[PDB]
């Protein structure tokens, strides 16, 4: 094994292990996601979360996604580790037709979006 390639290989294991826990679908920008996680508050109560994916920072094991939603009244923007053990169910509900890699503009547009 080449010493330069170790950090590649070490990612190659770490992703592909986690994906065999649960297969993650092909999410990307402008997709309505619902996502539930086994919250460790000493209770497996199953708090779901929902909203648009406004971003996708691809970066191996800590690949992650920025979900925006207008929660009760206010705007909220939770980013998730895509290959967490804590995360249980990812589901792609619907697909809006955006054409930009990140949608940070959507932060300051309207509440009627989301």
């Amino acid at each position: 094994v080449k010493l330069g390639d170790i950090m590649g290989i070490l990612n190659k294991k770490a992703v592909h292990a986690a994906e065999e826990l649960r297969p993650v679908p092909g999410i990307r920008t402008g997709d309505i996601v619902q996502i539930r996680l086994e919250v460790p508050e000493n209770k497996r109560r199953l708090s779901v979360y929902k909203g648009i994916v406004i971003s996708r920072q691809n970066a191996g094991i800590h690949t992650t996604i920025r979900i925006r939603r207008i929660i009760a009244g206010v705007g909220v923007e939770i980013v998730f580790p895509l290959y967490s053990p804590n995360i249980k169910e990812i589901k792609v509900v619907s697909h809006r037709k955006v054409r930009k890699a990140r949608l940070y503009y959507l932060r300051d547009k309207l509440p009627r979006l989301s």
Binding site: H62, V79, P81
Partner: protein, 120 residues
């Protein structure tokens, strides 16, 4: 990241409409207060007929912030607003209802806040 002279929305129905921060409390020589921390604020406006009048120095506790607090999970959480809740003294807020959404980190020191919350 709320500091001296920051304007802060109110997330409960104690009567006050908007606050302005003038000091952090707890952990002295702190530059700014992130979610969980208690601040001191002057009320800059209120609904007319409520008990809490304008121009009064009172304590609040910061619950919504524009500057991502982080879990150990790895999940981070922005909001779109900087907003605090008007604490009474030790325990509960003055109003018997809280709005918006609020985090789990608050429930250790402020049990009564996450009791009254809509969407935790």
């Amino acid at each position: 990241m709320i500091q001296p002279q920051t304007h802060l929305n109110v997330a409960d129905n104690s009567g006050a409409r908007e606050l302005m921060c003038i000091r952090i409390i707890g952990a002295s020589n702190r530059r700014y207060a992130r979610i969980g921390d208690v601040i001191v604020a002057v009320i800059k406006e209120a609904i007319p007929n409520t008990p809490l009048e304008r121009s009064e120095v009172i304590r609040a506790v910061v619950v919504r912030t524009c500057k991502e607090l982080k879990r150990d999970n790895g999940m981070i959480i922005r909001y779109d607003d900087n907003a605090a809740v008007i604490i009474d003294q030790e325990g509960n807020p003055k109003g018997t209802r809280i709005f918006g959404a609020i985090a789990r980190e608050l429930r250790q020191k402020f049990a009564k806040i996450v009791s009254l919350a809509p969407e935790v």
